[PDB]
């Protein structure tokens, strides 16, 4: 394993495979907020941005430089800060972001510019050798809310769907549907057996596991 950030401490990346890496940023309340970077031959894809835009060029510019390939499209799970505050910059830069036809209209309600709102409920995206599948489990943390999987990998971007070992709450539930909550959770692990490795929004990035504890929390 290796762990490598910028020249300000801000940003950094962590690797899992020869092309899956994981960034994290802070927001002082400081609250870490973490996603993936898919190195394809094709180009750089970003599953989920930052908290802003200020955060979110500072990223890109860092692994574009580190890949020395363009970050041609991103993904975005839901349409809150830690997930959407970077579209700004997103389509400022010409950058695809792909996202549910909720998540988009969502991000108008909050202040936010609109993403592409191209995935349906099942959607396989395809950049050079790197096949990536979106899906809508239903509510939960948002009712938005989607989770990213990477079949050559069987591994899982849980979002802020799925709490981390660490988290002993479930965080803000302002925009939450605590009962369908569960159920979502069923029909990811209904959907995905063999699950290699799971990535949480916000902490440490375990196992199948993480999915059992989310539906303790909400017992
Ligand atoms: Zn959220
Ligand atoms: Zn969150």
Not at 116 to 130: C, W
Not at 141 to 150: A, K, R
Not at 167 to 184: C, F, H, I, P, Q
Request: proline residues 2%; neutral net charge; charged residues 25%.
């Amino acid at each position: 394993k290796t762990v490598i950030k910028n020249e300000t401490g801000t940003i950094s990346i962590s690797q899992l495979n020869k092309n899956v890496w994981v960034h994290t940023e802070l927001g002082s309340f400081a609250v870490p907020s973490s996603g993936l970077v898919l190195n394809t031959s094709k180009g750089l894809v970003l599953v989920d941005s930052s908290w802003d835009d200020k955060l979110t060029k500072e990223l890109i510019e860092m692994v574009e430089k580190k890949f020395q390939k363009r970050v041609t499209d991103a993904i975005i799970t839901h349409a809150h800060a830690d997930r959407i505050g970077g579209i700004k910059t997103l389509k400022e830069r010409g950058i695809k972001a792909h996202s549910t036809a909720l998540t988009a209209e969502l991000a108008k309600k909050n202040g936010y510019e609109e993403p592409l709102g191209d995935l349906q409920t099942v959607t396989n995206l395809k950049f050079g050798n790197m096949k990536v599948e979106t899906f809508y489990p239903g509510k939960g943390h948002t009712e938005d809310n989607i989770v990213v999987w990477l079949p050559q990998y069987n591994i899982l971007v849980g979002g802020c769907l799925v709490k981390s070992t660490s988290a002993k709450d479930l965080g803000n539930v302002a925009d939450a549907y605590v009962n369908e909550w569960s159920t979502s959770i069923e029909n990811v692990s209904k959907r995905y057996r063999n699950i290699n490795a799971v990535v949480p929004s916000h902490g440490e990035v375990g196992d199948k596991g993480l999915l059992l504890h989310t539906l303790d929390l909400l017992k």
